Amino acid sequence: SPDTSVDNKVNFSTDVIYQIVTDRFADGDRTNNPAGDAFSGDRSNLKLYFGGDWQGIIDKINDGYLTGMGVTALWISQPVENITSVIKYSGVNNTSYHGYWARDFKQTNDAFGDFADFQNLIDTAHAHNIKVVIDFAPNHTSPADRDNPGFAENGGMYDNGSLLGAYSNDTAGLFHHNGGTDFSTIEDGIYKNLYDLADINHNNNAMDAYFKSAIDLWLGMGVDGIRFDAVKHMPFGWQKSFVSSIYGGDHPVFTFGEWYLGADQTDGDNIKFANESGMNLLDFEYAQEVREVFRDKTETMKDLYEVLASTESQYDYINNMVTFIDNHDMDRFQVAGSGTRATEQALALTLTSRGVPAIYYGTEQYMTGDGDPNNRAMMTSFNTGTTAYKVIQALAPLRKSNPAIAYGTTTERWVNNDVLIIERKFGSSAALVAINRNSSAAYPISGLLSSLPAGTYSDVLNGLLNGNSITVGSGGAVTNFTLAAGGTAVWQYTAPETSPAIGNVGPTMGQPGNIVTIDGRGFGGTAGTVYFGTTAVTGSGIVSWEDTQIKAVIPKVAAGKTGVSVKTSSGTASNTFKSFNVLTGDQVTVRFLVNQANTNYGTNVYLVGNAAELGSWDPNKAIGPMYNQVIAKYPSWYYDVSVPAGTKLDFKFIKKGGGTVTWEGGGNHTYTTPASGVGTVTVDWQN
Ligand SMILES: [Ca+2]
Ligand SMILES: [Ca+2]
Ligand SMILES: [Ca+2]
Ligand SMILES: [Ca+2]
Ligand SMILES: [Cl-]
Ligand SMILES: [Cl-]
Ligand SMILES: [Cl-]
Ligand SMILES: [Cl-]
């Protein structure tokens, strides 16, 4: 099947995701509605269930509302069984309508539907060429007070109906009992409770096994992607090991996490997570910047391009960035009382920009509302005639049809305070996008250059956002034109490719034996060669091969990041997909603890070792800075690390700070890791 197929679970840049808060979209089945204090019939309390469900989503697929927009993926609230108790917070009755307060990850939230309903949703979506992404929140269960078992449901965790444990009498040690985080440090936010949510202890193998089993259940039903909740609040090492187990199993899928960033914020740990965890991220840098430029109008198009350029520089897999202009955790993009062009332009940019675009339900209806839960009102209308609906309808399909949009580089062609003209390019395909955010002033555009072949190009939007046609000369030079006030236009060229071009490889990380999906153009119909670094993969190493997609088995090559490339049956070489992370083997999560490691203020302890997963003795790749406040206390340090299973590791600790790097003396520490699951190794610092 082709790169654009709904069957393609691991790569999503040809898609447009529509993010649905299930309870707030459509009530398709009144018979599963919660009742009494848990339900708001008059919708006056935005913290109770309103009744939205899976049948409702199914209905809006079948009746053409969603398909008419050209969305090709649905991202839905966590589907698992949540607590059913009503909690009074700050004078207001609250429910689990949002899906984040799980109690049994192996059963459904009955308010949304049963497993038959869920299968119908998967099957209906797939029959319409729509992928399904679920929220998954393995950080915690639900609200709990260790000292008051009667509060809520005491964070109780069930396994297909049978009790594993609750928070107050945590016999099996399933949870952390370290208080609640104050969000002051990353460590603090990982090993203490997020708000009052009973925090899962993933270093307990019972929990590693449980969550692997649970996710396998949902993936086995046909789920195409996973949006991880609160990734900043779980150990990086556990998450890396977790996704590796997905990639090495029967159901590799696209994964991405939420690591919130405010306006004007870049974060090195956020970048490391996206580059090294094996999991992708929502692109808050993009989102916040688009909001500043279009919604708040506090920064310029030059600032916008700067962020496109800096994100490109820092993230290894830029076609995996999940972009958006708002979501369940942000004020609604539409400002009440303001015009709609800001929304329409922000949508157009997102739909034509690199990555995987996501649109929050009701954006296309200009829904307003600041703060949670005002930003989660019931869908106001299913009017297919709005300008925003038509913008998405016109541009969403380009991600499937034009590989420059799906995979292409990004280049600034023209910029001033109010106007941005960018070009996407992939092989001979290109798209040129022009946006003028100024609603009162038109701008003459002169000396514009493009990679478009000669000829006249109509605006893909046909002037819906006051765009215009352009004429292109032999050298790609664009005849002078005026970009109207509020103007937005898209001009595009798609061509058959003869030379092979790789647009994406997914997943981006894997152990030998995993099957990866290589998407692009010009691979031809006859099986050729896949390369990992200089190592050729041929014959049975190639699972399947067609013009736009190749599936290949990761060869037993040296672990570490490497380039992936192809060569056609005729011997023509492709470009290289950079930074594919070859793992040593199946992973386990190991908690490393080192004792008696005293340091001066400003100096931290890091972990290094012989395996690629331990940085291959490179002090610049040393793992850390390690933690020393919660699980273990200074001068003990600890860190949870994904390492190859059933493998003898050689390792040492180092102290880095003040431009100095000091390694342990003595011989290496050694440790043979567990065959599966999780482990712990404790050693003492060697002077
Ligand atoms: Ca319902
Ligand atoms: Ca239909
Ligand atoms: Ca946690
Ligand atoms: Ca900014
Ligand atoms: Cl169906
Ligand atoms: Cl290219
Ligand atoms: Cl093409
Ligand atoms: Cl083959």
Three-state secondary structure string covering 592-617: EEEECCCCCCCCEEEEEECCHHHCCC
Which of the ligands is closest to the CA of residue 187? 3
Considering 352, 380, 401, which residue would you say is the last residue of a domain?
401
Distances (CA, A) of 597 to 78, 183, 602, 633: 42, 26, 14, 11
92 and 207 together in one domain: yes
C-alpha span between 388 and 520 (Å, rounded): 30
559 and 593 together in one domain: no
Asked if 471 contacts 456 with a C-beta cutoff of 8 angstroms, the reply is: yes
C-alpha span between 576 and 579 (Å, rounded): 9
551 and 466 together in one domain: no
Asked if 22 contacts 76 with a C-beta cutoff of 8 angstroms, the reply is: yes
Burial 642-661 (b: 16+ CB within 10 A, else e): bbbbebebebbbbbbeeeee
**Nearest alpha-carbon partner for 17 in 134, 162, 121, 139:** 134
> What's the gap in Å between 496 CA and the centre of ligand 8?
23
395 and 502 together in one domain: no
Structure tokens at 682: 């404790």
DSSP string for residues in 294-358? IIS--S-HHHHHHHHHHHHHH-S-GGG-EE-S--TTS--SSPTTS-SHHHHHHHHHHHHSSSEEE
DSSP H or E run through 103: strand 102-108
Which of the ligands is closest to the CA of residue 291? 4
Helix (H, G, I), strand (E, B) or coil at 545: strand
The catalytic residue positions are 229, 258
Pairing label, strands 356-360, 17-20: parallel
Which of the ligands is closest to the CA of residue 112? 1
Considering 401, 417, 445, which residue would you say is the last residue of a domain?
401
CATH label of the domain that carries residue 543: 2.60.40.10
Residue type, 391: V
Helix (H, G, I), strand (E, B) or coil at 513: coil
Is the Cα dihedral 349, 352, 355, 359 positive or negative? positive
- For residue 373, is the peptide bond before it cis, meaning its omega torsion is within 30 degrees of 0? yes
Which of the ligands is closest to the CA of residue 23? 1
260 and 149 together in one domain: yes
For the chain, helix (H) and strand (E) counts, in that order, are 12, 40
C-alpha span between 292 and 263 (Å, rounded): 8
φ/ψ of residue 362, rounded to 5 = 85, -10
Total domains present in the chain: 4
Structure tokens at 7: 């069957």
Angle between helices 268-276 and 236-247 (to 10 degrees): 20
Burial 325-350 (b: 16+ CB within 10 A, else e): bbbbebbbbbeeeeeebbbbbbbbbb
Indicate the annotated binding residues for substrate: 100-101, 140, 193-196, 227, 232-233, 328, 372, 376
CATH label of the domain that carries residue 7: 3.20.20.80
C-alpha span between 452 and 450 (Å, rounded): 5
> What's the gap in Å between 573 CA and the centre of ligand 8?
18
618 and 556 together in one domain: no
Distances (CA, A) of 35 to 22, 40, 82, 86, 90: 17, 8, 15, 11, 21
Asked if 187 contacts 630 with a C-beta cutoff of 8 angstroms, the reply is: yes
Answer left, alpha or beta for residue 366, where phi above 0 means left and psi between -120 and 50 means alpha.
left
φ/ψ of residue 129, rounded to 5 = 65, 35
> What's the gap in Å between 70 CA and the centre of ligand 2?
13
Q: Is 89 exposed, middle or buried (0-12, 13-18, 19+ CB in 10 A)?
A: exposed
Asked if 641 contacts 607 with a C-beta cutoff of 8 angstroms, the reply is: yes
> What's the gap in Å between 59 CA and the centre of ligand 5?
11
468 and 530 together in one domain: no
> What's the gap in Å between 571 CA and the centre of ligand 8?
16
Indicate the annotated binding residues for Ca(2+): 27, 32-33, 51, 53, 139, 190, 199, 233
**Nearest alpha-carbon partner for 610 in 660, 673, 563:** 673
Q: Is 491 exposed, middle or buried (0-12, 13-18, 19+ CB in 10 A)?
A: buried
Structure tokens at 489: 């236009």
DSSP H or E run through 180: none
Asked if 472 contacts 207 with a C-beta cutoff of 8 angstroms, the reply is: no
C-alpha span between 83 and 97 (Å, rounded): 10
CATH label of the domain that carries residue 442: 2.60.40.1180
The number of beta carbons lying within 10 Å of the beta carbon of residue 224 is 25
Structure tokens at 215: 């996710």
Structure tokens at 498: 């003869």
DSSP H or E run through 238: helix 236-247
**Nearest alpha-carbon partner for 507 in 576, 588, 577:** 577
What is the three-state SS of 479-504?
A: CCEEECCCCEEEEEECCCCCCCEEEE
467 and 537 together in one domain: no
φ/ψ of residue 88, rounded to 5 = -90, 105
Asked if 581 contacts 546 with a C-beta cutoff of 8 angstroms, the reply is: no
DSSP H or E run through 530: strand 529-532
Structure tokens at 301: 């198009």
> What's the gap in Å between 535 CA and the centre of ligand 8?
17
Experimental method: X-ray
Considering 376, 401, 426, which residue would you say is the last residue of a domain?
401
Tell me, what DSSP letter sits at residue 566?
Answer: E
Q: Which residue blocks in 359-413 are alpha helix, DSSP H?
A: 387-395, 398-401, 403-407
Structure tokens at 331: 């004020």
> What's the gap in Å between 642 CA and the centre of ligand 7?
39
Q: Record the resolution, in angstroms.
A: 1.7
Helix (H, G, I), strand (E, B) or coil at 529: strand
Which of the ligands is closest to the CA of residue 266? 4
Asked if 468 contacts 452 with a C-beta cutoff of 8 angstroms, the reply is: no
Residue type, 407: Y
Tokens 């937005």 found at: 488
> What's the gap in Å between 548 CA and the centre of ligand 8?
14
107 and 146 together in one domain: yes
Q: What's the residue count for the chain? A: 687
C-alpha span between 340 and 327 (Å, rounded): 17
Q: How many CA atoms lie within 13 A of 169 on its CB side?
A: 4
> What's the gap in Å between 464 CA and the centre of ligand 2?
26
416 and 394 together in one domain: no
Helix (H, G, I), strand (E, B) or coil at 285: helix
Indicate the annotated binding residues: 27, 32-33, 51, 53, 100-101, 139-140, 190, 193-196, 199, 227, 232-233, 328, 372, 376
133 and 251 together in one domain: yes
> What's the gap in Å between 563 CA and the centre of ligand 3?
34
**Nearest alpha-carbon partner for 253 in 577, 576, 514:** 514
Is the Cα dihedral 617, 621, 622, 623 positive or negative? negative
439 and 357 together in one domain: no
567 lies in which domain range?
A: 497-583
Which of the ligands is closest to the CA of residue 111? 1
Residue type, 204: N
C-alpha torsion angle, residues 54, 387, 423, 575 (rounded to 10): 20
C-alpha span between 672 and 588 (Å, rounded): 11
Residue type, 680: T
Report CA 238 to chain centroid distance, whole Å: 17
C-alpha span between 478 and 455 (Å, rounded): 10
Calculate ∠ Cα 548-431-6, nearest 5°.
Answer: 35
Helix (H, G, I), strand (E, B) or coil at 368: coil
